[PDB]
């Protein structure tokens, strides 16, 4: 930092000095002087360097070992009180040399005058309300005071208020008045309220504190600006934006939503394609991000939860304002030099070319504290001196000197050139941090950092509320047909319903999905929910595709049965009149079509949520989902089995042949892995027995990689270009270069689909699958990966004992009952296949028996045959009607046995752990 303003010199008695470059004295303002961390032995070296500079008046060059005597350079530091969090105490050996001055807040009453001067300044644009300069200021000050007392650090660690908030509010009020239309008192009050919302209540967490701030705003307005014409001051009730008009005026909600939709469609088309749904919170946050990006040093920190839309929302808002989006393409083996080069390129584009970039820094786009320090230096100042120093400085000053000449402005001094450079960076570079969970150590360090927290506008997206989920679901379940279930409006409590009052099956579906998501997060997740619905969206998409597929299947089966019935009516033998009876399945179709939506909901929820659950958690949450379906008026197959419903016999035999176990848990896990291929599957298993199984499924096409080997980055680029299944042996590690592959975010063209990996664009064959595989369940995965990927647990938990001993007990306690249990379902399934087989046999035989007589003997004998399987089907159904009650009665006894067995095994495993 000193290299720009200091000039090393040499003298015989004056071995190298480091004085001013100019003739003016130099004052080193070291802000946050007590912030740097201290070594493990308890000594922070930067403070000792400062003491050396103030006591010894010099230091030692580390390459050359020469005493450098600083000349007429003064040291002025600034520090928060040591009692503040993160403030390391300073040694008395350093502060012994410095005069300490305490600067408190300006008494709380002087703030009134200090900002009344600002309001008198900014009301020169609107003289008609000159007399309102004094009220506003007091109100503003009062607001600040209240927000300082209500929202303390005890609630949230980022609830730090200061007069800087008041200055931001005054600048916002001016920059809305300056570019706004002719104003009225109601308009000014609403404008001030909007700016107050954006300054004080953006960082607030939870609806309770937002409502508290809203009532505080109402009280302040009624106390200091007792106007009589005002609307609702709620966050979504007032919307100020210059996207529609050329001014900055409060816009109607409907026009804003229509414009946002018609622009978002174009953005999804011409830019990267991500099918997305527009809702009210999206519009509000688009306005917030637009306001932040519009100002000069507009940096934002979006603290929400994964899969909320923050990154793509920032990209959309940048595209609206014509900002070049730059995202650091870093990976696991990316060091500080790569980040420095990326920042250098971004700065060069920002200043030497006036590119107006928008650097989106994710939480995971920083790996060590050096990246965060680079962000601090870039944000606190408007430049990073460490990038441009030494000879690289000499080039920069050259590139400035040419460039500043091309703008028609003359600047020959180095200081003037660098000041123009800093100003261009400040007014052209916007940094938008996006962090998923703020309780993580990296994200907590990002938030608590002084430069970021003081320069960035903390916008707390938070997780989706029930209104946003209802809007998204309504816009997502409006594509699939539901004109066959014959829904009847059910009687439910007003608290249970989330969307508009239930009048159709679609509202019931969205209510069930929202309620199950809430219950699932209530059971699995504890305390606060830093997880935004990615399960909800994936479940909605799965339900869409599954309803479509199941209704197509039902249509095909109905068509087959109807054409068979027409043929039998056409066939005019003696026994076909009884196949008129056995074609009563047209009556069964009416019952099985009513339960289609319920079965599809259960199967989609099972595919999405239960991938990473135990054998008992799956049962409990399935019971919860069934009681939720029963709470509303949607029906489902009472004896529903996921394996039977989704996977067919052929696929199950293929999986068993490939090497999969006989467990129902493993069959369900494999069904989840294979059936759901809209998202990458993440197979977790301690034994690697699945890695071979998948390979056995894909023969010679399987390619095994890992995130540890050096050539992996290239090898995938081959497998991704020639269509070979990829299994990555490690998943706990993850280099974000595969990021654009984890989320299906491709660059389409005429007929070639292209994906960006690192900085290479590679063509996707279309035969390429990706399975991520992990071994240790103890290992963690990045929040970006975990919420995008279909996590499937292949572990053999303790609860696997609970069922397994049953299969032993019933084997050696009721041998006949165990024998009938398996063959009941086995014969049932093979009957549902072979009766259809015989029906199409009969149909094609009738096709071949149009007018012959000798051929009818085979028709008659097969007609008599089909009666046998009809009797067996009826007998099996009648026997099951009594077997299932007895089976469920018999389950509970051996469940009692297993309750003790699992505890015994847990004690044994704790013994083994010791």
């Amino acid at each position: 930092a000193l290299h720009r303003h200091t000039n090393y010199v040499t003298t015989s008695k004056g071995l190298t000095l480091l004085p001013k470059s100019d003739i003016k004295n130099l004052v080193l303002f070291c802000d946050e002087i007590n912030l740097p961390k201290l070594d493990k032995y308890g000594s922070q070296n930067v403070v000792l360097f400062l003491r050396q500079l103030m006591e010894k008046q010099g230091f030692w060059k580390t390459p050359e070992n020469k005493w450098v005597t600083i000349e007429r350079i003064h040291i002025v530091g600034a520090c928060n009180p040591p009692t503040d969090p993160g403030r390391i105490p300073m040694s008395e050996r350093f502060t012994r040399h410095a005069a300490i001055l305490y600067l408190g807040y300006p008494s709380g009453k002087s703030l009134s005058q200090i900002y009344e001067i600002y309001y008198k300044a900014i009301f020169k644009l609107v003289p008609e309300f000159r007399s309102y300069t004094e009220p506003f200021a007091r109100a503003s000050v009062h607001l600040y005071n209240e927000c300082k007392a209500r929202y303390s650090t005890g609630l949230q660690s980022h609830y730090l208020f200061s007069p800087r908030e008041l200055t931001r509010l005054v600048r916002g009020v001016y920059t809305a008045i300056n570019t706004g239309p002719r104003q009225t008192l109601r308009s000014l009050i609403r404008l001030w309220a909007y700016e107050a919302w954006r300054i004080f209540a953006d960082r607030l967490v939870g609806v309770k504190e937002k409502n508290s701030f809203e009532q505080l705003l109402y009280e302040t307005v009624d106390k200091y600006l007792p106007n009589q014409d005002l609307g609702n001051i709620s966050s979504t009730s007032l919307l100020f934006s210059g996207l529609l008009s050329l001014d900055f005026k409060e816009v109607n909600k409907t026009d804003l939503v229509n414009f946002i939709e018609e622009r978002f469609k174009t953005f999804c088309d011409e830019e990267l394609e991500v099918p997305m749904v527009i809702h009210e919170s999206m519009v509000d946050h688009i306005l917030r991000i637009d306001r932040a990006l519009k100002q000069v040093q507009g940096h934002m920190m979006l603290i929400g939860a994964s899969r909320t839309g923050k990154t793509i929302l920032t990209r959309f808002v940048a595209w609206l304002n014509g900002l070049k989006i730059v995202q650091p393409k870093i990976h696991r083996h990316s060091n500080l030099s790569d980040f420095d080069m990326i920042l250098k390129k971004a700065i060069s584009d920002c200043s030497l070319k006036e590119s107006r970039t928008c650097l989106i820094i994710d939480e995971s786009n920083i790996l060590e504290t050096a990246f965060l320090e680079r962000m601090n230096t870039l944000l606190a100042n408007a430049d990073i001196p460490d990038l441009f120093q030494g000879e690289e400085y000499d080039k920069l000053l050259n590139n400035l000197r040419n460039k500043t000449r091309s703008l028609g402005l003359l600047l020959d001094t180095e200081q003037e050139l660098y000041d123009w450079f800093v100003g261009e960076i400040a007014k052209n570079l916007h940094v938008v941090f996006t962090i998923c969970d703020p309780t993580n150590n990296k994200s907590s360090a990002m938030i608590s950092s002084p430069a970021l927290f003081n320069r960035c506008i903390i916008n707390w997206m938070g997780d989706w509320d029930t209104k946003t989920m209802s809007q998204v679901a309504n816009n997502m379940v409006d594509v699939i047909p539901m004109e066959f279930t014959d829904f009847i409006v059910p009687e439910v409590n007003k608290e249970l319903v989330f969307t508009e009052p239930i009048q159709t099956i679609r509202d019931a579906v969205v209510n069930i999905l929202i309620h199950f998501d809430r219950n699932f997060y209530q059971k699995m997740k504890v305390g606060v929910n830093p997880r935004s619905p990615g399960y909800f969206i994936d479940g909605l998409r799965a339900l869409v595709k599954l309803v479509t597929a199941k209704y197509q299947d039902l249509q095909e089966n109905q068509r087959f049965v109807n054409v068979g019935l027409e043929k039998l009516n056409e066939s005019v033998k003696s026994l076909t009149f009884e196949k008129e009876r056995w074609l009563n399945t047209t009556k069964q179709f009416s019952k099985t079509s009513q339960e289609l939506i319920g079965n599809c909901i259960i199967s989609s929820i099972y595919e999405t949520y239960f991938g990473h659950l135990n054998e008992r958690e799956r049962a409990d949450m399935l019971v919860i989902l069934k009681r939720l379906l029963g709470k509303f008026a949607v029906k489902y197959d009472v004896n529903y089995r996921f394996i039977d419903y989704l996977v067919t016999l052929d696929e199950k035999m293929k999986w068993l042949e490939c090497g999969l176990d006989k467990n129902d848990y493993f069959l369900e896990n494999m069904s989840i892995v294979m059936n759901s291929q809209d998202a990458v599957p993440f197979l977790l298993d301690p034994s690697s027995h699945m890695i071979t199984v998948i390979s056995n499924y894909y023969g010679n096409k399987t390619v095994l990689l890992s995130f540890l080997e050096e050539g992996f980055v290239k090898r995938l680029e081959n497998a991704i270009r020639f269509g070979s299944v990829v299994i990555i042996q490690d998943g706990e590690f993850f280099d974000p270069i595969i990021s654009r592959l984890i989320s299906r975010e491709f660059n389409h063209a005429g007929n070639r689909v292209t994906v960006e990996i690192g900085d290479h664009e590679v063509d996707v064959s279309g035969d390429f699958k990706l399975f991520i595989h992990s071994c240790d369940p103890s290992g963690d995965i990045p929040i970006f990966l975990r919420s995008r990927v279909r996590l499937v647990h292949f572990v053999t938990n303790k609860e696997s004992i609970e069922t397994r001993i049953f299969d032993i007990t019933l084997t050696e306690e009721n041998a006949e009952m165990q024998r009938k249990r398996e063959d009941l379902i086995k014969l049932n399934t093979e009957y549902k296949l072979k009766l259809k087989n015989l029906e199409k046999r009969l149909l094609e035989e009738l096709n071949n028996s149009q007018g012959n007589m000798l051929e009818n003997d085979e028709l008659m004998v097969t007609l008599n045959n089909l009666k046998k399987e009809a009797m067996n089907i009826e007998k099996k159904l009648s026997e099951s009607e009594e077997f299932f009650p007895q089976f469920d009665n018999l389950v509970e006894e051996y469940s009692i046995i297993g309750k003790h067995s699992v505890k015994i095994f847990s004690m044994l495993e704790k013994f083994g752990q010791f």
């Binding site: 010679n700 096409k701 390619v703 050539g711 290239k714 090898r715 081959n718 497998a719 270009r721 020639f722 269509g723 070979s724 005429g750 007929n751 070639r752 063509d763 064959s765 035969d767």
Partner: protein, 306 residues
């Protein structure tokens, strides 16, 4: 205008540019109406306007078939399966057919089969681009040469080319998984064969060069040690002479890959490395025989003992 539009219809497809074609079609549309009614009543104006509207009706098709992925094989398939005719090979292989043929193919209707064949065209070009990149890289690769005290030439930076050869071999292996590999098999197989031979020569060469450097410090410099081991140094001098001739003839080629065509190169390097390993074993046995006579030499090592 009729002469101009007839001339623009006869330009070879290998030279047609859509950017100027748009302006030319705009001019044709502008100048169609200004023709007198004598042209309008005749078939000349009607045919001209119909052909101009045919050209302007499809413009995505023209730019898609202007892509580099298209090849004479694809043009032959398009002509045979859509145009129902055969194109002269000289007219086809150079893509010099006129725009009238493109009109004949009727891009408006057969666009579904057109896109079906173009998709295959881009995937085959995905394979061909990797093949061309590998060939271009290995037609310009060369070692980095230095000269030490002796007249021998030494290679530096083995990795920058060894890793490239290994990665290219892995790429050529992985190309077999692609469905559209059959047409490119006859070239990929030969390229893989050449790269395997080059990789074997590289593996022998790095070891030969390393062992020769290691032994040059021991033998060939100190006269005393060569006197104690006359057979070893006598063999070493002949090895150095043969290696010098081999390396001079090898770097007289300006390309790394062409060493696979040098007569008796890989076997020569195998013999050289075998003889160097035998000389190293002889040194080890001599040093151990010296140490077993005065065992305190076990506290010194090899360089000190030498």
């Amino acid at each position: 205008l009729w002469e101009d539009v007839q001339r623009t219809f006869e330009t070879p497809w290998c030279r047609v540019d859509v950017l100027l074609l748009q302006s030319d079609l705009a001019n044709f549309l502008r100048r169609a109406d200004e023709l007198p009614r004598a042209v309008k009543q005749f078939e000349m104006y009607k045919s001209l306007f119909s052909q101009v509207n045919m050209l302007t009706s499809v413009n995505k098709i023209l730019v898609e078939l202007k892509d580099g992925a298209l090849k004479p094989r694809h043009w032959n398939m398009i002509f045979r399966d859509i145009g129902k005719r055969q194109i002269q090979k000289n007219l086809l292989d150079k893509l010099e057919f006129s725009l009238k043929d493109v009109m004949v193919l009727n891009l408006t209707l057969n666009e579904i089969l057109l896109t079906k064949i173009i998709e295959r065209a881009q995937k085959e070009f995905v394979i061909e681009k990797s093949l061309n990149r590998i060939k271009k890289f290995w037609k310009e690769a060369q070692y980095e040469v230095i000269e030490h005290s002796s007249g021998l030439k030494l290679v530096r930076e083995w990795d920058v080319l060894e890793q490239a050869c290994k990665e290219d071999l892995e790429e050529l292996v992985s190309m077999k998984a692609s469905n559209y590999y059959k047409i490119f098999e006859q070239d990929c197989l030969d390229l893989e064969s050449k790269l395997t031979k080059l990789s074997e020569i590289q593996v022998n060469w790095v070891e030969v060069q390393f062992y020769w450097l290691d032994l040059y410090g021991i033998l060939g410099e100190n006269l005393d040690i060569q006197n104690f081991l006359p057979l070893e140094t006598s063999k070493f001098k002949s090895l150095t002479s043969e290696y010098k001739m081999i390396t001079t003839r090898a770097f007289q080629l300006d390309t790394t890959i062409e060493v696979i065509h040098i007569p008796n190169f890989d076997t020569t390097l195998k013999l050289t490395i075998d003889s160097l390993k035998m000389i190293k074993s002889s040194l080890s046995t001599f040093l151990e025989r010296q140490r077993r006579q005065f065992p305190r030499f076990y506290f010194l090592g090899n360089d000190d003992l030498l």
